[PDB]
Structures are given as C-alpha cells and as structure tokens.
Write a protein that binds this DNA or RNA. Structure first.
Ligand SMILES: [Zn+2]
Lengths: 55, 57, 68, 96, 112
RNA sequence: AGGAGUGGAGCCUGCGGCUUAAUUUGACUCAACACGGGAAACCUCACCCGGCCCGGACACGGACAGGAUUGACAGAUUGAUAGCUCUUUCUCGAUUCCGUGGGUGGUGGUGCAUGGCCGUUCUUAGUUGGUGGAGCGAUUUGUCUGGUUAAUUCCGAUAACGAACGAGACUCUGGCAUGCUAACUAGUUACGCGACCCCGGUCGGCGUAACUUCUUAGAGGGACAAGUGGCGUUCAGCCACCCGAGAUUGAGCAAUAACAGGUCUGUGAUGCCCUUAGAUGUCCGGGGCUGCACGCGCGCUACACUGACUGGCUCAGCGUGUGCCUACCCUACGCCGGCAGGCGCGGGUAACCCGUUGAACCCCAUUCGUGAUGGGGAUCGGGGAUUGCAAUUAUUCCCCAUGAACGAGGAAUUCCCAGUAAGUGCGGGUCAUAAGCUUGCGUUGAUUAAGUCCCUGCCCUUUGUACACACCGCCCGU
RNA sequence: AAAAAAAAAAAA
C-alpha cells in the first residue's frame, strides 16, 4: 500500500521533526524560546520581533 | 534573553558574531481592596504598552 | 524515455462488455437469480456482490476474505 | 485527482458561507485542523483551490507557510451556478 | 507575521505601517495607509474580509477584533510609503533619473 | 623587553591526494581549511544501487454512466502484507485515460546577470560644500612649515573665514551615594519559644515590632586635568603629587569611493540554460559523506615531586527549566544495585521548586621516591545499563584487564598591557541519546613596557613621467 | 602553433 508506506519514517525525533516557519528549510534552526526558525530569516526579521542592538 | 548568532549567511569571511537582548522589568503591587476597584483599574488606563494580570490567593 | 532498464507497463484493465447484464438470470418470470453471494457486512452495501474466483469469493471495498 | 465528492461539496458550502479560508503548506498532513468533524485531507484541498486558480475564480497569496484565497463576485456567481442556488442568499462578506 | 502579511497584501494600496493593541474582548489593530479609498474597497468590504482572514488564521473568539482605518499625516515623511511609491512609478516604466529627482524634490518639499 | 605557546609525541576535526559503483559540492595568502551555525547511525542528502504514486493545473481534439480508472486475496517476484505485474472484478461513478500546446517542480548549471546580506580595504583617519582670494582656464587656498593627542584632536605660523560627514559627541554595563523613593516571591535587627554545653555561647531551628545595613532597582549626582609644582611659543598639551570610590573599564553603531570577494545549497528574492512521468520533483529501503603509502591547520592530553593517589576542610556567577504544528522540561525526597542506572513520591510555568545552585582550583594529614615509575592512558578483550523502529563501520556511559609513543621538540610561526595573559570549573547553542567546537559566566592571578620604524604592512608630502583601459603601461630596430 | 576582446553607449 502506497497510502500506508507513505509514512514509514516517523518524525517523533531527529532533525526532521521541525523546520523553519518562514523559509521552510531545515538548517540553522533556533530552538531557544521556541522560535523554530532559521538564522538568516532571524536576522532579516529580528528588528520586527523587538530584538535590538544594545550589546 | 541573550541570543548570539553569526554574521555571514554563507561560510566565508571573518568569524564575526552579533548580540540580541531586551530589558524586561517586572513590577507588582498588592492591594487590600475589593474586586470592584480591581475591575475599575482593569477597565481604566488601557494602553498597548503594558499588560495587566490579576490573581487572588 | 526508453532507458537501459525496461519499464513494466501499468495494469491495463481490459474493457469488458455486457458485465452489468451478467448479474441476474433472465427467465420467463420476472424474479431475480444472481450467481454471486451477497455482502452481509455494513462496510459494503446490500447491492454489492462478491468476486467470482475459482475457489473463494472476495469483497470489494470491505477487503474481507470469507473462506469455507 | 482521484478525490471524492462529498468532501468537496463540504468545502464548497463552507466557502459559500464565508469566501475565505486558510491552509498551511504541508503535504504530510492527513487532517485539516479547522475541519476536524469529518475526515478530510489537505493536499487535495489546496490542489482543488489551485484548480480554481487555473479556472480564474480566486487569487493566491503565500506569505510564510499558509496559502491564502480570496473570493470574487465572478467566483460568487460561479458558486451560484455550480451549487444551483437561487440568487437570494449571499455570502456574509458582502453583508453588513 | 502580521507585518509581513500586510506588506504582501497592500503592495499597491500605499501601506505605511500598523499598530497592535491588546485589550480583553477588544483585540483591535489599526492600519495606517496612504490610500484610504482603496483599503476599504467597496463599502468597507475589504477590511472586513481581511478581518475574517486574520480571525480564522491567527485564532480568536469571533467578534473580539475590530480593525480600523486611518490616513497617516505627513505621507512624504514616511520612508516606506515613498519606497512603494517609487516602486509603483518604476513598475509602470520610467527613467530612474527623473523619477529620482521627483522623489528627492518631494522629500525636500515635505520639510525633511 | 617579556609571558603563554604552536610546530615535536598520541588523540578529535577539516582540506588535498589516493581509493570508491558513491567516498556530493562550495570555500585555496592575509580576506578558506572546529567554515556553511555542516558534533552526517535512519530523515538530513544535494552521492550510488534499487521500486512504486502523481503532485501532467489545465485549453483543444479522440472516450463517456452501457463504464475513464484506483483500492486487493491462495502464489513466482525484489524489499516490504508497494497488485508494480501476472489468476479475478463487484468494488469510485465523470472526480477522468490518451495526442499537441501550456503549466508546475528542481540543494540542477550560471554570485562573471543580479537584488539583499556579510567580509575585506578600515576601524586606519579620511572626505565635502558656502563665501572670498589667485590663475585666461583646467585648477589651487581653505585640508599647513611647526608643536600636541588615540584621532584632519587641538594650539599656532597664516587670503583665508564660516560649516558638515567620520572620530569624538551618543547608548548599555561596572565602579557609590550607611542619601531619597520601596520590598512575606529578597532579607536584617530586637522579642518570645525550642535544642545542647558551662552564667554566657551556637542554631539557613520556629513565630510576630521597625528597617533598607546585604540583595533587588527607580529617580538623581560625582569626575571635569578640579588643585599644587615642573616642562612646553609659557599656548595647545604633558609629567609627578595631595584630597577624593574610580585622575585612560569594556562593548554597540561606525564617512566618500571600490572589489568581476562569498552566498542562485536560507527564502514562494530572482533573469537565462537543462529536465519533467520511463523524472535532475517526490516517496521508501540499504549503503556511502568516516573510507587509507602520504602532506598540511585549528584544538585536547601529558612528557612529572611546584607532581600522582587516598580522606577531611571550605568558596561563586551568567544562566537554563513542561512545547500551536509536538511528543523531547528542570528536579528534590525514599528504597535496589559497586557502578552507570531501575521503581514509586512531591514542587516549579518560575527570586518561591531544583538552589543558601555546599563547583573546580587551592588548603590540611598520609602513601609514593627520579626508575618510561603509583606519570602519561593511545591500542585492545569481555560483561552490564539508557535513548530510539534500528547502534555492526564500537551512539553514549559504567566495571575489570591491556600500559605503546613520549626525558620539554629543528627550520619556522601566532596571541598579549590589569583583574590582563595563564591554570581551572560552571552555563547557552549544537541535543531523542550530546562536546576535544563556539559564545558567555565565575575562582586564583602574574613577569615585562609607557617606546621604536629594524623587520612586516598601511597612510601622507615632495620629486620625475614620452603613463590615462593608467607599468598587466607606452615604445625602438632586424 | 596557446590568447583576453579591455570601453561601460548621455547628462528627460
Ligand atoms: Zn464486503
């Protein structure tokens, strides 16, 4: 069955359980404070979050 | 909330970083008053800057 | 395209004719006489028949095998 | 495109009540979150609305991970023709 | 997400910015746009269906959001609105030099 | 002048080369080589071998409910209970099958088409108008002979005055106000009770009258070369000293102009090329990115007695902590086991619970005795636990055996002026299992110097030019 | 028996 063989690798764990919420790429993720979103889009939209240049 | 990320989107160049923080200040006042004054305080002075939460023990 | 490895063709279901006229038996009387046993389950309807194999009759969407 | 009939007319009647829906881009998701009352997919849903895009009844915006669809008045009269309703009930977007 | 949504939506309607306000049962948001007659659409249809989109996508109890419309003062003193103005001018197809001098003269006549 | 070193030995990682069906590719002096947040068991994946599904939206033309096709069963069949085929069609009823255009998709090629982002020139101190003056004009002065500072930072010589950018100026943290405004989610002091010793002593033992003295954090100020003496056009400014908390704490942004610098492998940022059902898309299974005569670069451990081992004493701060998709949170207490670990038992959506975070180093008392040794723990065998569907090409840890090289490393080369280097330990990212990497925190805490242009680079003035695509230039003769 | 051709083509 294709419909039962289509989900044979569970995504309970591993790097495949999450992806970027903007560019949808599975690299450079930020799991800290539940951002779940890649670093380059983090730099692009960091000013809109409220994140500031202070240090 | 300190988050340190890189600078280069690629992997070429000088190894430089960047720093992100906020200042988050917490204030509480305890009051020996009935709930009607609490609802009047909640209804009055509504601004998008600071949120109001009330609890009773 | 045609590569080194030959491609197995898909299941071409041959168009059979007079199949819907092959369910019941035509006689002088108007009564019905089907050659396929009925489906007593609730997954497939009362008008749903079985298959006609050599040894055992098989459901459709029920995917249930009733042996003898 | 071996997709059933009753789920699509359920999508169409929930479209006729309100002409906008949202759907996240996830092929590996067997259940719609808002339409949890009955078993519906998501990939067949977004393929149906991009077929409506190919027909020219809605317009498409994709922001981060969600596809966005907007109902037109020509799409409204297409819904009236397909569902065969008399012109006396209107989707709630036009109402006050 | 809301800022990127409204930036993608009101590309040609002169989007300037939005403000977010939090209030129980009155979670209202106000969009500031240069073209007031085009954000509403036809008798305020467009603002209500954008309200429906953000209501059914973000997720609230219904009736808890009331979007408003307002025209921002000093339209020339907004760098964003001049950027979509320049994009609207150059998408039709003109010379970059004369359009750049026109927008520079508009900024200098705006009081900057 | 020094300190720590690297390069030497073993070990981890990357690159080249070789090998491989595949060992995927970018990145080759600063300005690539523990880089892509790239610690790859499966997804990652872009690489190889293998098999299905369409995710061909669709416009037209052949077919239409009488059937256009998916979903499967004794059994050959890989790899699977993918019917993918083959025995058999009821089952889905117009959702469609086929030919052409068209469309979609691509971690496919092109960063030398690019946008955007970042690095480098350079964080050096360097640019530019207005007016006036000189020159027929291009142009020049303002921007400078000189003195000073980290600084085109100032003084001053002076057809130059008046201004801007960069630096400074600005922001954040620390240094302290026994002042001010306030703390039962932080405590202090008095009083009462309780426990022990001999009349007083200790209690982070218990409870309730004031308070900010610790901590916490708001408003303010202090520091400005303020004063004295010396040097100096007695100017700018520098040095020594006194009172005073501090007489140079550190970080962010960082001007004009420019690189054929890197990123189409961050993006549904994107032009062109190639391909698209028998797929350079997608799904699933296995293997491979790790592979080994060899060469290079980041790092870890030691080459011992200023040390190793065994017990006791005693000291912190950044932090983090139960999830939309999601299910992976931090733990005290009480038993079992040497141990890693196993089972119950509460707290915390957080100054309350972990936690007074009883950290390491160091200190005290033995053992060791210059011997590749009780240093060093590479290599190797067996057993036992947890995570996960799966640990072989050891995931990780624990226990016992195994004890190699290594006696302070040639040429060469890197980083560094005060809580600094260095020796330690603790957090965050990586994370189902998880640090030899990186970013921070904290303990202890130095030697040397207040300079130079010798080396190595950068910048400026003058000078010469037959150069202006500008020495990678122009140009002579056989 | 190997080459590279340097020119970007107003100032609405
Ligand atoms: Zn049946």
């Amino acid at each position: 069955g294709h419909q039962q063989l289509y989900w044979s690798h569970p995504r309970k764990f591993g790097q495949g359980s999450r992806s970027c919420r903007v560019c949808s790429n599975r690299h450079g993720l930020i799991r800290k404070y539940g951002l779940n979103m890649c670093r380059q889009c983090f730099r692009q939209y960091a000013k809109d979050i409220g994140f500031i240049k202070l240090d | 909330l300190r988050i340190t990320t890189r600078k280069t989107p690629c992997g070429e160049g000088s190894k430089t970083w960047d720093r992100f923080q906020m200042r988050i200040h917490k204030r509480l006042i305890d009051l020996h008053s009935p709930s009607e004054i609490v609802k009047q305080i909640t209804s009055i002075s509504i601004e998008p800057g600071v949120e109001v939460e009330v609890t009773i023990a | 395209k045609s590569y080194t490895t030959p491609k197995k063709n898909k299941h071409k279901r041959k168009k059979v004719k007079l199949a819907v006229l092959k369910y019941y038996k035509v006689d002088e009387n108007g009564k019905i006489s089907r050659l396929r046993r009925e489906c007593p389950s609730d997954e497939c309807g009362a008008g749903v028949f079985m298959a006609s194999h050599f040894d055992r009759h098989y459901c459709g969407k029920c995917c249930l095998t009733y042996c003898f | 495109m071996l997709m059933p009939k009753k789920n699509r007319i359920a999508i169409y009647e929930l479209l006729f009540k309100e002409g906008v829906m949202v759907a996240k881009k996830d092929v590996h998701m067997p259940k719609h979150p808002e339409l949890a009352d009955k078993n519906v997919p998501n990939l067949h849903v977004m393929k149906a609305m991009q077929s409506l895009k190919s027909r020219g009844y809605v317009k498409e915006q994709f922001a981060w991970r969600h596809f966005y669809w907007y109902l037109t008045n020509e799409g409204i009269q297409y819904l009236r023709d397909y569902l065969h309703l008399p012109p006396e009930i209107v989707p709630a977007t036009l109402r006050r | 997400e809301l800022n990127e949504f409204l930036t993608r939506e009101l590309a040609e309607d002169g989007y300037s910015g939005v403000e977010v306000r939090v209030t129980p049962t009155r979670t209202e948001i106000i969009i500031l746009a240069t073209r007031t007659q085009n954000v509403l659409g036809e008798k305020g249809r467009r603002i209500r269906e954008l309200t429906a989109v953000v209501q059914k996508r973000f997720g609230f109890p219904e009736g808890s959001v009331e979007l408003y419309a307002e025209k921002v003062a000093t339209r020339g003193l907004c760098a964003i609105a001049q950027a979509e103005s320049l994009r609207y001018k150059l998408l039709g197809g003109l010379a970059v030099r004369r359009a750049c001098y026109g927008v520079l003269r508009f900024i200098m006549e705006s009081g900057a």
